Symmetry: C2
Subunit: 86 residues, 2 copies
Amino acid sequence: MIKVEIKPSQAQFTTRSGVSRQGKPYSLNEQLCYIDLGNEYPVLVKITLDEGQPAYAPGLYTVHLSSFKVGQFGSLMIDRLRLVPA
Amino acid sequence: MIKVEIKPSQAQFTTRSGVSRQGKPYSLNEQLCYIDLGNEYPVLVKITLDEGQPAYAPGLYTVHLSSFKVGQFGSLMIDRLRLVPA
């Protein structure tokens, strides 16, 4: 299991916006977190949230299976990091 | 934890080869596996092995933390799926 932490300072998201190739508006909400990748300290990672989802509250989390998909070359890829409480 | 299975029929690797941009030879060993992504059946996924590593034997495995890295846009990515026995 991957250990993800949302620190007290990371409790908010920011929003970027724009227009798709054929005219549709979009909005993307982004939040930061720390992930332990086995180095001396956890590293900073950007998360893009799914539509209609609030920012994750401070605390410890792990990664949900729905984060992964098989890519166009047949290998596993991350789609979006989706988190669940630890 | 991600459940990965190497079936009896997937006990071998194949090797692809070529030459890098500035002249060096390379060889890549590839093996197939089944990964449970929560659909009705596990899906087929291609793994590229690390240098000097044998094919994983048939059995159940999970994903090692060393499979992940932070990508050039600050989000988590899979580098190569590295497995450890379940």
